[PDB]
Design a protein around this ligand. Sequence first.
Ligand code: ICS
Ligand code: CLF
Ligand code: CLF
Ligand SMILES: [Fe+3]
Ligand SMILES: [Fe+3]
Lengths: 522, 522, 477, 477
Amino acid sequence: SQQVDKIKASYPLFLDQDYKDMLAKKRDGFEEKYPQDKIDEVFQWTTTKEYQELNFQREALTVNPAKACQPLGAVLCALGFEKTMPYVHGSQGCVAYFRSYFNRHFREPVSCVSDSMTEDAAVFGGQQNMKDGLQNCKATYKPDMIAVSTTCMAEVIGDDLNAFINNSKKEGFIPDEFPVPFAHTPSFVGSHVTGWDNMFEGIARYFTLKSMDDKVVGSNKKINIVPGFETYLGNFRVIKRMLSEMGVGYSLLSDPEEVLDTPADGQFRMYAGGTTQEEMKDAPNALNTVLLQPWHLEKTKKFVEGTWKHEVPKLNIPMGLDWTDEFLMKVSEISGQPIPASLTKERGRLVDMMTDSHTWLHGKRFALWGDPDFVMGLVKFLLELGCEPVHILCHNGNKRWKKAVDAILAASPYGKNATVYIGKDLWHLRSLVFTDKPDFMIGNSYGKFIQRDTLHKGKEFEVPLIRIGFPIFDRHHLHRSTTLGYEGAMQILTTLVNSILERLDEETRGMQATDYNHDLVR
Amino acid sequence: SQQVDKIKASYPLFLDQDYKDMLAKKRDGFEEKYPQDKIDEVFQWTTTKEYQELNFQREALTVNPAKACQPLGAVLCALGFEKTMPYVHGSQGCVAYFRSYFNRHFREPVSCVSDSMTEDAAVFGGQQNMKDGLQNCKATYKPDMIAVSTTCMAEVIGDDLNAFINNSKKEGFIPDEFPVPFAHTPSFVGSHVTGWDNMFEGIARYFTLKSMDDKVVGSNKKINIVPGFETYLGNFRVIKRMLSEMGVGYSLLSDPEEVLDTPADGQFRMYAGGTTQEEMKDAPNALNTVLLQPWHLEKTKKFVEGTWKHEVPKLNIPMGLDWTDEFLMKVSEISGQPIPASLTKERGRLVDMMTDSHTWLHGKRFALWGDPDFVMGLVKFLLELGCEPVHILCHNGNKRWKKAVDAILAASPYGKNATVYIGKDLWHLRSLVFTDKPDFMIGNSYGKFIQRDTLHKGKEFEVPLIRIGFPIFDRHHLHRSTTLGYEGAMQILTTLVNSILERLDEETRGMQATDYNHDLVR
Amino acid sequence: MSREEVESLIQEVLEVYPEKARKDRNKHLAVNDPAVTQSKKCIISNKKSQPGLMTIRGCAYAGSKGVVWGPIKDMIHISHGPVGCGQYSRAGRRNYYIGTTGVNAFVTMNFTSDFQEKDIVFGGDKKLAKLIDEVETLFPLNKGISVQSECPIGLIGDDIESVSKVKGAELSKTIVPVRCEGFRGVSQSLGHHIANDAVRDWVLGKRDEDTTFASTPYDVAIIGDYNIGGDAWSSRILLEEMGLRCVAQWSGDGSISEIELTPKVKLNLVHCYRSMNYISRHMEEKYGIPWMEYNFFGPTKTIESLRAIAAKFDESIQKKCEEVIAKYKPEWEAVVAKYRPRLEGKRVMLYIGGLRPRHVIGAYEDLGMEVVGTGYEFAHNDDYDRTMKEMGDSTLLYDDVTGYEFEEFVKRIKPDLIGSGIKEKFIFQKMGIPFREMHSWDYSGPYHGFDGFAIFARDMDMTLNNPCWKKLQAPWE
Amino acid sequence: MSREEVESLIQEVLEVYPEKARKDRNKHLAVNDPAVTQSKKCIISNKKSQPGLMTIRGCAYAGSKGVVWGPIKDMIHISHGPVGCGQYSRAGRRNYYIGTTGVNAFVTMNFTSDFQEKDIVFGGDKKLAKLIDEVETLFPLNKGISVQSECPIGLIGDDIESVSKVKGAELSKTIVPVRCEGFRGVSQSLGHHIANDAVRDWVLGKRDEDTTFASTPYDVAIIGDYNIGGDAWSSRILLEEMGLRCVAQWSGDGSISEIELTPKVKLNLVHCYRSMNYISRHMEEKYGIPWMEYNFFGPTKTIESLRAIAAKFDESIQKKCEEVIAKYKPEWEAVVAKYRPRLEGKRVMLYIGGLRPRHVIGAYEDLGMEVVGTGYEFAHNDDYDRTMKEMGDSTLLYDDVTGYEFEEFVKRIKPDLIGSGIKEKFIFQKMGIPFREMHSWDYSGPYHGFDGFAIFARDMDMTLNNPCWKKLQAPWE
Ligand code: ICS
Ligand code: CLF
Ligand code: CLF
Ligand SMILES: [Fe+3]
Ligand SMILES: [Fe+3]
């Protein structure tokens, strides 16, 4: 039933007695469900160390992975550019999923087209799909450039992106001078971040490879910034703001910040802002190129060093205090501009926040996961805060990254209990947070189910989730946050300390039992 | 006992069995405690509407007030000025409490001195205290200005601040040209915001009343901004940023932003930033003066209109969308500067967030409290978001402000169930949130105990607290947040929608009972 | 607005297309005539999307894993192939269920073989066998395994049927290989058909010789209800209050044992004709069970469908149906009285997948709220024959609408409200037109039955009349 | 640092002051002589603060309401006067308790008469009576009312004693008027004395003629422990494990009935001599109960104090004391083994109130940690006589230190760690010197007893050796 004054959505409508009896009758009569005691026994078993051993013996089964496929990152990178239509050569279902994924994370329109390859193409290729799709996309949505990635179908059948685009231009489907960069983004290689890397390198090679004769390093007195796969608009904004404060001329290549934050003003803008073609053309004239996320920008690094002759500085992700300091000092040395008083003041206020909150942060144990550069920045900032990252997980990280983060942990006494896992998924992490319980998790929305499972064991075993990363689906507008620089470190510190404080408040809210420690002042 | 590997603080140390038995023996042997059934019955009675009627019949007893005393606001205002020492004429315990209060809220040093009046001064007066304190403060802390407020002791004994300061100057205790503005800030009139108003008006009268001969309105082509009692640094920052983007010359009068966010760089700065004496001297030459919080800046408004000859615009607090729009349009017409594309884009982005989140925000019921301008801005934004402010409470509000907020509620269909209470405290609100349960509370840290009490009735009766306002003691660095302008509206919207989503996630975390609605995507 | 105005609208929108795309898309746009009972003479459907036109359609994997097989709770569904599709479809669709996740129910979990380069080069059959063994070791309470093929599985010549059969014989467990690779077909609809054939061939006929189930002449099976936000539960409550026994749910909150028990029912109540009409037809053929299409969207339609269902049984069921209608009449009458004045006479454009484009028009009109345009992502011509009789005269009909086409249609028609998926929501919200997600109920619901209709009216009122839509234009512009 | 260097430091800090302030403050700074057993010949204390010098001391209301009376849980403490004092003191001090807040315990609530202008001009006595009536109506389970006076009460001629007496006779309830107006005295210490007199005169004697309490020769009371973060509980556990019966706690987690039962104990264990030595002396005089000062800060001090307390009873108590010491020796030995190397030989300056400046030196030295400077906010000369012995040679002693004085002392001495209140924490953290709040244990604790010492060592290690202190200087400066 329903009351017109107080209408109930699914929760708590289905907690009604009549719905309860209906569901119980359905379960008993026809579901043939396992007895509740067997279910409880199996769950308790899944919380154990023996189950953790069996879990970590997994070789072919992946449960709840913490990564996506390359063309998603390619689509994001392509959205970074001005009036650019991401165009994924392959099957339409992939584009539908990419668009919905980014729609849910960013809560914004995501424009991406497919050539809608079908079983007919599976034996004949997507060449005609390429010609028709390029022509239709240009005529219909009028992009200034079309950035082409691939789905795993096109990668498997072996579609020659370069030949297909060239034949499209030759036959007159698309103008010969229309920029159509391309990158092969195989979904069975790496993760979404290497798709971003591949897309960016393809666009840079399209716009710079054939015109390196007139390029002089430093002639435009600018620094190139390649952000990598980034889903926090605040990170783009903070990098631009920090470089503007220093008076450093910069070119932010693949800047999707404008198109992912378009105003709702009565019209829909399919394109907005983004890196111009002129900026990409003039990029080899910069003083240097700085990669914000080096651990997934390898291909871009090799292209920039080998072709633009840029001596790319060995910089960690500008996260935390020491690494942001290194970023600012390197920028100051490359550009010759001194670090302004505003950035020094920002650093001092971040340090003040650390001093203010260190007692609550000290000793807290964390499980965390995400992309490699983000994870290692989180680990470094955690070590700077006196926290103990006990479980570090990067499903798409590699052994070099693992050695780097192990070296980072070995330089601090707060990394002694730390362990780094690569190639493991969130089911492995569920086992880890059961057998070696941390105080909190830091990760994306997929961690919520883990927090569910721990709560099922008991309130005293619950590991609350702190939502930092990608994707975040069950909270609104967190994509506007910042994680880079002093500002991002301040945001992360505030989130962490206040998560600790809200957990403590919940634990001490029981009157006459635990509320003796329900302090007003913390 | 304690284990060296895992040392327990009070929680959960006192949950140990031996401590439990010790406490039980203490309670049974000597505490003479009421039986648990009696306590439960009394509490259940306190949750009823009959108890609510008795509670609202209160005429003399105040329980858990949502306000402070005037000299606190006077100290904040005084801290707004450059190299200015707040100096409270009265007893030292008041200054200890003000400094502790602001230290806990801001997590920063708060510099304030007292002349340490004692029982000897209770009949003679504070003249000698005034002279010695002024001399010692100037010689020891080297302020450029001393802003003098009063504790209730000095107000009761009738200390003449003006005569005391003049006599101190005449006898060489302090130089004749040393600025010593004064304001009487009785703790038994109004609240802390009234003290801020009084202090600001006293400083403005000190610096402008005798030099109005050479003042021409608009001669400096600037707009004066008086922020009022403000404890979010982001509010000062966002007002300055918005006026800077508009190209509008402005003077922020009583700007404590720098001194309350000094960097931790190895030295302690007792003074930093603040409104210069030249700025306050030149303020009458502005185009106009805009009061950000008109409902507690009455005295300042009368002084500005009557003496500075500024026609102060009738503007609501720049909170929400409509009122921020009105603020920007008024600034545009006063200064002649058009609203830039960046601010229009910010407005469109806030509107986009509203469209994105309205489904979760729609119909949600709220209880809220705080200072009048902040509360009315919160109500306006809530009505703009489709939320239903059910209980609106302003302990220090008045009937004019009540009529204004009732008029605002009558314009929207989401204010029909709303009721506005003035002169009521957090115990009244406890009764209200028991008898007519809202979905959430928005208020300062003192609300946590209310959330405790509701949880004691049951989880289904718990009203979670959303911490917006002053003071915030049980969370770290929330004073850095923003509540004014589009940026502040975005922060408030994010906080509200994510609080709703966090509560729903908690309610649907029970596996096989409510987790059918534990949606990944919201 | 006149039919000729809509015709000129269609031509004007089509003008910007290249000639081939223009002539193709001309066949997918029509002006509705409710008198006509045929679609092939008015519209074309179930056709390939034009490349590069931003089609909203998904793939066969989405229509099979995400739609039919996925909701089945006590089964473990392996997204066989690279990590992407399983990750993007993990808990994206709100097919609600009761269970202990990770123990006895696995709907919101992403089981995948996480294909790497070596899996593509050498194949994944050995990986699939080892994955099945690890699944049994780590999830012993699962009651069956389904293997949903992704594009490379059918592209690299993987033999998942053999692996399924061998591991099923060895493990004494039902393992269903579903060749739902995303390139097959043109949309999710072929996913519906392939998943239906998988159910028919691997699961349905396992209790054919089992007579231990006590059957009654009041046995019905809900077919094609996926419990979106609890829709199937809100329909089953009314089915059982009418005295019938709902033996199975297909497939929202659906157990595999329910599917195996379906051939024992007396009446199949097919809600989503598009996705499970195939299995309904096969059940009617082989087992003799008659099926009928039914509609629980809105009070008028649910009353009509309840009466129709009760007419297929004896007089006790008819009396129970009348009692149910009598007890639910005040609820939807009060809902209508509260919400009709704020929604009366408001034009809606809908673009949902294959059943909700039609089949919710009655729910809109029960609030006095007209529909001026409708469209299908992946429907067949039978869907359109059922659509014309319900759509009003001189309304717009679009099959596989493009992003630009939808944009232009909304720009000229200027509907009061739009109902579509997540890839249109923010586009149309930025234009100031209130938007309701009609796939996920905007994380609300259910919308089936009388309780679902109350929720439906509340949500439509909350989004249509929200203050936020009077704010998109800055006052200084 | 040599004694001559300390004297030069004192002069080179004092020269900034005007002559009168210089000569006054010169009496409040000293170089500690551990060979001197008198304070009047070395330092001056319990004197008025110099105006305008940013003294850290509070008022009599803070020392009475916030300190002594406030912790008593089952009483309702009315902050009589304007809203400010009660609001600032509400739940500022972590005097922990067990109870149902708002029902049977009221420690963290702010009851106030919220004085307005009319209350100031006309008096608040009848307002106080009506407030008491409303308190009884709305909080019927309260076991007594205390009325803590704020400055206007003493300045406007309010007769709260008459109101308390009359309403107590009418209500048959203990109503205690406390004349703790902030202008009285020079600091919180006179608040201690006035609150002690209030306890003695209005509460203590109510069970003088009552013999229903079964007394034992093992009866002790804890006097001057305020359960800061649970300190009193961590002391009482050790007291009762020694076989003793702790009848009362004064006043952390303390009930009014426990206070009324205190005259029946055999030994008063005075922890904070400064705040409750008055009531201890009165109890010794009128009731004959001997009292002794005791110290539970750190292992050496708590072992010595436990042995001293056991020496005042028979041999069973001494044997129980030895058993307790043996059982707790491994715990604090393991704490020392874990934390001594990280804190060994590290200099600390302390500025706390009346007891913890001394009385915690042993806890620091048990971790191999030297105290080079110490000072009192509001101590008397007896406090300094007890301070000289515990302080090492050539250490700095400061009474009522000014903000500038503390700043300069820390600047030259450069201590490894500072222990003081909240009004110094951020000042000294900005200079890069690790800070420990020694009033509230930085929202940690307890620090009393062996468990408290483990917490103390952990907190000292966490703050002293925090990485954040190697970061205040930017690398480019
Ligand atoms: S199955 Fe189909 S697209 Fe019939 S694939 Fe799709 S939960 Fe739609 S119009 Mo999402 S043929 Fe169901 C559908 Fe309709 S996922 Fe749901 S809403 S009634
Ligand atoms: S049409 Fe459909 S969703 Fe597309 S792949 Fe094919 S079954 Fe799957 Fe998959 S991993 Fe990523 S998302 Fe693709 S590129 Fe491959
Ligand atoms: S020394 Fe002590 S704290 Fe000061 S007033 Fe006096 S008892 Fe109280 Fe009170 S309301 Fe505010 S804080 Fe004062 S000015 Fe009066
Ligand atoms: Fe700080
Ligand atoms: Fe949006």
